[PDB]
């Protein structure tokens, strides 16, 4: 598909970051919200590893129309890994979510909600 | 402004390369890479959230207390390289393609966390890049 950008900055910003360490080992040394393709992403963290789907799709369902929930399992474990993608059709949808969801709990235990993806 | 994250798995030979790689910048940017045999490059700008949670789930693993000397190294069969920077520790961890395979080598319990970690990792991946730009491996 389409080449990557050209990032000088990004590409030294990596550099700094990678000489400022103190620790190394391995063979290898040897703002503003972005919409998705159909629709607005909201990112849900601090989620209990005892919840599923269902209670998820229940507590942001009255915000808008839910296009998609992602609520990836722990490879090992098999409980829920602790955060969530929910996208909504609309921009107002999910900032309305977001707004309310954000610091409200799930089965007694805080989560946090912001946007998945920015410009 | 403090987090790096980079993972690779795949192939260089004669017939071209095949691979797939993921790569976390430190300003958010996400640059995913996959090459079959078709050909998918991708780039999008993460919350900060996300940046967050990725360093939560690599902490909760603790693959960085891991050394990967003992593990399989690349051969010319396929090759996965994770590279993470985490404040001041930084790893770049390597080994060959991918279970009961860990359980009788070297070191069976870090090659295991190694493992599920990745799992981890291309599942947040998958899900960030199926679900924004309606694409997967």
Redesign the interface.
Known sequence: ?????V?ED?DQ??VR??E??????????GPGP?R???GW?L?V?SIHEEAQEDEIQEKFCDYGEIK?I?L?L???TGFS???A?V?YETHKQALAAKEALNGAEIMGQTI?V?????? | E?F?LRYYVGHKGKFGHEFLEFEF?????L?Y?NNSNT????????????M??LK??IIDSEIMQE???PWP??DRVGRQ?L?I?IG???????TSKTLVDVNRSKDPEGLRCFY?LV??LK??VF??IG????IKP
């Not at chain 1, 598909?1 to 950008?5: H, L, P, Q, T």
């Not at chain 1, 400022?20 to 040394?29: D, I, L, Q």
């Open positions: 598909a389409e080449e990557f950008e990032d990004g910003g990596i970051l990678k400022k360490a103190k620790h190394r080992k391995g063979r290898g040394f972005q998705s393709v159909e992403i990112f963290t998609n992602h990836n722990d490879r090992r890994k602790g955060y993608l996208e946090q912001d946007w998945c993806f920015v410009k | 403090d790096y910048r430190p300003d958010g940017k640059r890479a050909m998918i490059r991708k780039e999008a700008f993460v919350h900060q959230s996300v967050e949670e939560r789930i050394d990967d000397l190294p690349p390289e590279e920077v001041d520790e930084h790893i770049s961890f390597t599920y799992q981890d599942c947040l899900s960030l679900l924004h730009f309606k």
